Amino acid sequence: MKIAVAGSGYVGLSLGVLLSLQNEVTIVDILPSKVDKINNGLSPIQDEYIEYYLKSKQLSIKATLDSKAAYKEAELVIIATPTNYNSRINYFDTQHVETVIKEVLSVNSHATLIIKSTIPIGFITEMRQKFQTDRIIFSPEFLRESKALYDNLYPSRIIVSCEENDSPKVKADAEKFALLLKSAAKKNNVPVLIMGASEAEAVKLFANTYLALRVAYFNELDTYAESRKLNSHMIIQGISYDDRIGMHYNNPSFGYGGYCLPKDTKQLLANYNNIPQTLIEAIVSSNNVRKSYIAKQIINVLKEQESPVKVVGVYRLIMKSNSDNFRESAIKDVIDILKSKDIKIIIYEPMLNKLESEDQSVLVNDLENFKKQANIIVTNRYDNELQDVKNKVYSRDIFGRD
Amino acid sequence: MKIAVAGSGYVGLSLGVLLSLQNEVTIVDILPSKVDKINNGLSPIQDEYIEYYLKSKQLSIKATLDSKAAYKEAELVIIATPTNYNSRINYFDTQHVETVIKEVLSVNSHATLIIKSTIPIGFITEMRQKFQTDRIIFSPEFLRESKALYDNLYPSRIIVSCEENDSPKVKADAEKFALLLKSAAKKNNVPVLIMGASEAEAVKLFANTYLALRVAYFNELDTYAESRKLNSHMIIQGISYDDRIGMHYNNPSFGYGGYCLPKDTKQLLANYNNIPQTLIEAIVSSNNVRKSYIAKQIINVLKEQESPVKVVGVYRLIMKSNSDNFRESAIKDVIDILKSKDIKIIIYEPMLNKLESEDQSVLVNDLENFKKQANIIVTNRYDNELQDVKNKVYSRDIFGRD
Numbered sequence A, B: 001m002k003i004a005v006a007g008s009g010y011v012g013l014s015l016g017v018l019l020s021l022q023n024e025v026t027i028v029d030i031l032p033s034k035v036d037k038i039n040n041g042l043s044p045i046q047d048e049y050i051e052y053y054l055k056s057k058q059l060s061i062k063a064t065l066d067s068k069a070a071y072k073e074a075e076l077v078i079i080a081t082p083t084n085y086n087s088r089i090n091y092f093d094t095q096h097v098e099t100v101i102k103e104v105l106s107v108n109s110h111a112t113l114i115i116k117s118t119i120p121i122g123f124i125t126e127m128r129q130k131f132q133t134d135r136i137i138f139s140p141e142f143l144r145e146s147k148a149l150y151d152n153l154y155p156s157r158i159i160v161s162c163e164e165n166d167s168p169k170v171k172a173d174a175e176k177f178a179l180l181l182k183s184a185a186k187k188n189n190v191p192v193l194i195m196g197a198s199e200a201e202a203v204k205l206f207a208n209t210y211l212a213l214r215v216a217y218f219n220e221l222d223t224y225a226e227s228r229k230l231n232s233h234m235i236i237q238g239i240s241y242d243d244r245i246g247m248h249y250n251n252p253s254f255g256y257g258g259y260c261l262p263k264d265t266k267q268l269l270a271n272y273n274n275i276p277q278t279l280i281e282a283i284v285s286s287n288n289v290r291k292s293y294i295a296k297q298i299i300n301v302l303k304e305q306e307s308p309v310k311v312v313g314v315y316r317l318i319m320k321s322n323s324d325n326f327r328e329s330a331i332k333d334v335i336d337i338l339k340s341k342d343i344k345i346i347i348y349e350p351m352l353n354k355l356e357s358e359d360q361s362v363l364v365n366d367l368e369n370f371k372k373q374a375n376i377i378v379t380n381r382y383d384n385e386l387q388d389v390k391n392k393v394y395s396r397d398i399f400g401r402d
C-alpha cells in the first residue's frame, strides 16, 4: 500500500518508519533539513528505535517537500502536523491540519485521511461539515518522546474512529488502518477499539489530562512536603504501595512539561465550555501555582546568601529525563519568574548552541565554570556529575526518571 | 500479648479479630449491642471474613464496656474510634481519640498507644505535647468496608510511625506492632515502612485524596460524556488501556461516598492552610458540582413527563456496591437537592426499617409497588432486578462495581 504521512516529527516519523516495513511510505515536511535527513537514513530527532530502523531495517521510505506529488499517489494519508494551543483564541490552532486536509482533498478523491495529530473534541465532525466529506477520521497517538517508535511497536492500545453512517470505503479503511498498526506492532495482544470520532478525540485529551493530573497531584503533595519539612520520598512511597495508585509516573518536578500535556490540558478545559467541572481547570492552574512556589523557594535560598551578586545556575532545560527538546520545559517558567527579580541567570545546556539574541541569561557550557559561578544550582532532574557541588543544588527530583 | 482495641467498627473489629489469633485481645466499645454481639461470636457489621473468623477460628477475643479494666491490663492499645470531619470548625473532631488516649494514659504507664483512626497531619506531634509523652504513635489503616479483615490479611503495605528520639520501648513497640500485622497477614511479601508520624499521617490523607481524585475525574469525564451525548464506556475504556491509568477504580457514580473519602479530602484541604495548591480544593468541590449536575439531569428527565404528580423512585441508599451502610452516600445529597423542588421522593432500601421521623421521602420496600409508583428510578449502581422497568432508570453506572 502507498501511504503518505504529513509531518516529520516524533509522531510523523515513527509512524512513517513503522509502516514502511511492509508499505510504500512517503513522508512530507516543509523543512528541507528534515527531508534530506530522512532520505539519507537519519532521524531529525533523537530516538533509539527510529535511528536503528532507518539504518538497519529494510524500509520502503522516502521523504519530500512535494506535498501534492505525495498526496495524489497515496491510498491513505496520515496527518501528523502541529496543533499548538493558542493563548489568544483560547484553543488549538488547527491551521496546519486543515491546510493538509484541503491539499489532500484537492488532489485525491479516493484516499481516506487519517489524523494522528491531537485535535479538539468535535474537530473531525467539524472538518467533515466544512469539507463536505466523510473521508476524514481520527486515530489518537499515545507515544512518548524518546520512545516514539518504541511505543508504536509496543502500544498500550490502538484506536481508530469511523461513524455508523460512514461510507463502506471509509469504514473499511478505518478498520484497515487499525490492523496495519496492529500487525506492525511487535507486541502480540494489542487491544483495538473502533469508536466515534468525538469519543476518540476525547480519549486522547482525557488520557493526557489524567497524566497531567497525576503529576500535578504528586507535585502539590511535594509542595506540601517541602513546606512542612517532611520526607517527600517517604510519603510518595507510602501512598504508592497501594496498587490502585501505583509506583509509576509519580516523580516530583517543577511542573509537567513537554509539547503535549501543557496544551492538551488547556484544550480539554476549553472543550468543556460551560459543562460543570472544577478539576479540569484546577489541573491547569495547579501547574502555574507549582511553578510559582518553586521559584519562590529558590528566591529564599538565594537571599539567604552573602554575595555581592546572586547567580542562579540552571542545570539543563530538557523537558523530562532523557529528552532532546525543551518544549514547555517547566524550568523555563521558573527562570522567567526569577528574571522578574534581580537574579543573574546562567544556563548549562549542552544541547543548546546559543540563547535567543535578547535573552538576559548567559549560556555557560563549560560545566566547571558553571559550578564555579552558580550560587545555587537549580535543576528539574538531578544528575551524578553534580555530586561535587551537591550542597548547593536545589531539586525536587526523587526517583531519577520521567 | 494482651492487646486492647478501642472501637468496634470496621477498623476496630477487623484488627481485633486479626490479632486475636495469637494474641489476647480485648475490644472496647461504648455500645452494649456491639459488645454483646462480639462476645457471642457475631459481627456488628457485614463482613464475610470477620463473620467466618468469629465463628470458625480459634480466637482469644472478648468485648467489654469497661474501658479502664481493659486499658490497664493491656501491653498495647490500638485506638480505632471515630474521627468525623466537623463543618463548623473546618477540621476533624478528634475528641473520641483524645478521650481514649487520656483514659489509657491514666491507668497505664507502660503500654504504647497505637492510633489506627485517621487523624490530621500533625496530630501525633500535637497529642505528644498535650499529654507530655512519646508513647503515642500512628499506624494508618487502608481497609475497605466489606473487605475489612480481608484487607488486613492481604494488605498492600504496613506503616507504623516512631520518631528518631523516641524511647527504646516506643521504638521497639512500633516495630513490634508492624511485625504483628505482618505475621498475621496471610499474604507473604508485605512491605513494611517505619516513618515519622506526620509522614504517616500524610500518607493516609494523600492516599484517600488520590482515590477521591480518581473518582472525581472519571465523574467529570462522565459529566462531559453525558452532556455531549457521547459513549462514556467507550471513552473510559479507551483511556484506561493505558497501564499508567489502569482499568480499576474508574466507574462513574453520583459522587464519591462512604465514611472516609468525603472527610479525608476535607481534612487534607484544611491541613494545607495556605500552602499553595488548586487541585486539593478542586477535588472537594468537584464532588458537589458532580452531585448538582446529576440532580439537574434528573430534574430535566422529570419535567419532560406528563403526570399529575412527579415521583422519583430512589433504588438503594448504600454508599457503594455491596455496602451495608449509607455513610456519605452520594445519592443522599442528590435526594436533598431534589427535595429543594417539588418532587415526591420514594426510597426502596431493604436494609432500612424506617426513615427519620421528619423525612419527607416515603420508604417503599415492596419492590413491585416501588416500580409502580416511580416516574423515574434513580440509582447509583444498577441491578438486574430492575430490568422490567429498565427504560425509566437513570444511572451513570457502567462497570457494575465500586
Ligand SMILES: NC(=O)c1ccc[n+]([C@@H]2O[C@H](COP(=O)([O-])OP(=O)(O)OC[C@H]3O[C@@H](n4cnc5c(N)ncnc54)[C@H](O)[C@@H]3O)[C@@H](O)[C@H]2O)c1
Pocket: A006, A007, A008, A009, A010, A011, A012, A028, A029, A030, A031, A034, A080, A081, A082, A083, A096, A099, A100, A116, A117, A118, A119, A141, A142, A143, A144, A145, A259, A260
Ligand atoms: N510529541 C508527542 O509526544 C506526541 C504524542 C502523541 C501525539 N502528538 C500530537 O501529534 C502532533 C504532532 O506532534 P509532534 O511532536 O510530532 O510534532 P513535531 O513538531 O515534532 O513535528 C511537526 C512537523 O510537522 C511539520 N509541518 C508543519 N506543517 C506542515 C505542513 N503543513 N505540511 C507538512 N509538514 C508540516 C513541521 O515541519 C514539523 O517537522 C501534535 O498534534 C501533537 O500534539 C504528539
Ligand SMILES: NC(=O)c1ccc[n+]([C@@H]2O[C@H](COP(=O)([O-])OP(=O)(O)OC[C@H]3O[C@@H](n4cnc5c(N)ncnc54)[C@H](O)[C@@H]3O)[C@@H](O)[C@H]2O)c1
Pocket: B006, B007, B008, B009, B010, B011, B012, B028, B029, B030, B031, B034, B080, B081, B082, B083, B096, B099, B100, B116, B117, B118, B119, B141, B142, B143, B144, B145, B259, B260
Ligand atoms: N471505615 C473505613 O473504611 C476506614 C478505613 C480505614 C481507616 N478508617 C478510620 O478509622 C476510624 C474508625 O472508622 P470505622 O469505620 O471503624 O468507624 P465505626 O463508626 O464503624 O466504628 C467506630 C466505633 O467506635 C466506637 N466508639 C466511639 N467512641 C468510643 C470511645 N470513646 N471508646 C470506645 N469506643 C468508642 C463507636 O461505638 C463505634 O462502634 C476513623 O478515623 C476512620 O476514618 C476507616
Ligand SMILES: O=c1ccn([C@@H]2O[C@H](COP(=O)(O)OP(=O)(O)O[C@H]3OC[C@@H](O)[C@H](O)[C@H]3O)[C@@H](O)[C@H]2O)c(=O)[nH]1
Pocket: A141, A142, A143, A144, A145, A146, A208, A211, A215, A248, A249, A250, A251, A252, A253, A254, A255, A256, A257, A258, A259, A260, A261, A319, A320, A321, A401, A402
Ligand atoms: O512522574 C512524572 C512523570 C512525568 N513528569 C513530567 O510530565 C511531562 C510529560 O512526561 P511524559 O513522560 O509523559 O512525556 P511525553 O510528553 O513525551 O509523553 C506524554 O505526551 C504524549 C502522550 O502521547 C504520552 O502518552 C504522554 O506520556 C514531562 O515534563 C515530565 O517531566 C513529571 O514531572 N513526573
Ligand SMILES: O=c1ccn([C@@H]2O[C@H](COP(=O)(O)OP(=O)(O)O[C@H]3OC[C@@H](O)[C@H](O)[C@H]3O)[C@@H](O)[C@H]2O)c(=O)[nH]1
Pocket: B141, B142, B143, B144, B145, B146, B208, B211, B215, B248, B249, B250, B251, B252, B253, B254, B255, B256, B257, B258, B259, B260, B261, B319, B320, B321, B401, B402
Ligand atoms: O470507581 C469507583 C470507585 C469508588 N467509587 C466511590 O468512592 C467511594 C469509596 O469507594 P471505596 O471502594 O474506596 O470504599 P471505602 O470507602 O470502603 O474504602 C476507601 O476508604 C477507606 C480506605 O482505607 C480505603 O483504602 C478506600 O478505598 C464509594 O462511594 C464508591 O462508590 C466510585 O464511585 N467509583
